[PDB]
Amino acid sequence: HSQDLENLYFQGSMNIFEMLRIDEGLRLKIYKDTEGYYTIGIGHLLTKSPSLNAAKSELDKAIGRNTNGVITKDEAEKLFNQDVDAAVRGILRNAKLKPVYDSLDAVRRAALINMVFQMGETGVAGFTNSLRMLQQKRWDEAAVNLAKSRWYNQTPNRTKRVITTFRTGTWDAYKNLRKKLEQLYNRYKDPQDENKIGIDGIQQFCDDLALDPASISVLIIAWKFRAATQCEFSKQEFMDGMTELGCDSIEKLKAQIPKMEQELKEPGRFKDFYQFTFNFAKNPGQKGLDLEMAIAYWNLVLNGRFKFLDLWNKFLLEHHKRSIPKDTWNLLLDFSTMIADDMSNYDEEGAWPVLIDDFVEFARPQ
Numbered sequence: 001h002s003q004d005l006e007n008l009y010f011q012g013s014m015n016i017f018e019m020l021r022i023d024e025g026l027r028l029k030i031y032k033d034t035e036g037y038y039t040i041g042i043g044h045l046l047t048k049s050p051s052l053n054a055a056k057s058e059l060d061k062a063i064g065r066n067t068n069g070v071i072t073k074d075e076a077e078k079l080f081n082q083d084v085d086a087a088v089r090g091i092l093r094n095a096k097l098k099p100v101y102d103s104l105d106a107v108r109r110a111a112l113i114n115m116v117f118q119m120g121e122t123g124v125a126g127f128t129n130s131l132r133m134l135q136q137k138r139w140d141e142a143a144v145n146l147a148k149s150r151w152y153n154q155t156p157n158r159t160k161r162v163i164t165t166f167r168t169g170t171w172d173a174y175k176n177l178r179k180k181l182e183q184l185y186n187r188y189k190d191p192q193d194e195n196k197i198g199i200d201g202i203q204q205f206c207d208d209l210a211l212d213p214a215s216i217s218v219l220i221i222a223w224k225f226r227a228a229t230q231c232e233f234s235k236q237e238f239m240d241g242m243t244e245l246g247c248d249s250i251e252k253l254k255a256q257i258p259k260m261e262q263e264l265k266e267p268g269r270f271k272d273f274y275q276f277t278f279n280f281a282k283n284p285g286q287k288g289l290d291l292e293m294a295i296a297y298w299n300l301v302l303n304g305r306f307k308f309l310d311l312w313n314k315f316l317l318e319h320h321k322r323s324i325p326k327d328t329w330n331l332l333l334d335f336s337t338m339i340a341d342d343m344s345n346y347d348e349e350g351a352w353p354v355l356i357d358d359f360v361e362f363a364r365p366q
């Protein structure tokens with residue numbers, strides 16, 4: 001009962017959790033962070049173990065049920081609140097942070113905690129001049145000074161909101177952000193289902209971004225938004241992606257697209273994108289991907305990368321209808337990577353899909 005959120009009902013509805021939900025984002029399924037470690041919620045590290053089962057054990061232990069690696073928002077808030085309590089304890093025994101923290105009102109304390117989550121105690125303690133201004137209630141001067149920092153350059157939109165919070169002592173920046181995202185989402189949402197954007201809204205989104213829906217850039221955007229399926233774009237996907245990408249407008253999203261595209265050059269990221277495509281393309285009711293749909297997506301994602309793509313098309317157009325399983329999809333990229341220009345190094349004993357064995361027999365003589 002100690003962690004029950006009902007114990008916080010005397011607070012405002014806006015709080016540090018909701019603040020970090022906007023500034024960092026909330027994930028309700030176990031995922032791997034930057035450094036490859038299993039994480040959930042708002043940046044809550046579960047374990048450094050490579051074992052997902054280990055991560056699930058820790059999570060189940062913490063939540064008190066068999067989660068299967070999926071939690072609710074309220075469960076994420078409980079984890080986050082533990083983390084906040086630890087951050088506050090640290091602040092309160094730090095001679096450079098305690099005096100300013102103690103001096104601040106509740107809303108501005110949240111802004112300081114936000115900073116500590118982003119940059120750690122040492123990072124925040126480096127702002128000696130600005131912290132002194134805050135301790136002295138010189139809010140406008142503190143705001144001006146913080147805006148000159150590398151922090152501002154690293155995360156300008158988050159930093160601006162945190163600074164506004166210090167300037168005003170209100171949640172205005174966060175109310176405004178939420179409203180801006182709601183109003184933007186409302187431009188695209190399905191009028192018959194407010195939980196998602198349908199085909200017409202996706203088209204409008206593409207048009208607003210000046211992109212052809214058939215372009216690889218649109219698939220890259222879906223990948224960055226971790227979209228579940230090609231047929232719709234959920235409210236949760238839209239909000240989570242805009243949050244993760246640090247964007248509260250179409251202009252900002254447009255400026256981010258080239259950066260998304262560049263990520264495909266970093267280690268493992270093209271493979272991640274390629275594998276994502278299968279799940280996105282497949283009918284949610286089906287386990288495999290219809291061959292015709294697989295061809296369409298292969299032609300988008302592998303053109304200019306897979307030197308045998310045209311022969312692959314010729315091969316498949318002769319083939320009978322089948323569901324392409326995930327493993328066959330995934331292994332085609334590995335085939336593309338290893339295969340010699342004349343196919344002379346294919347290992348028939350490599351446990352490739354039969355489809356690829358058959359392709360090599362078809363192609364070697366062409």
Ligand SMILES: CCCN1CCC(N(Cc2ccc3c(c2)OCO3)C(=O)Nc2cccc(C(F)(F)F)c2)CC1
Binds near residue numbers: 218233
């Ligand atoms: C070779 C693969 C081509 N590809 C297939 C999927 C098409 N499509 C759904 C869509 C988008 C626009 C359409 C349409 C269907 O029919 C008419 O106009 C989507 O990408 N949907 C989508 C779903 C969630 C998020 C997003 C995204 F974030 F905008 F990128 C797009 C876009 C074109």
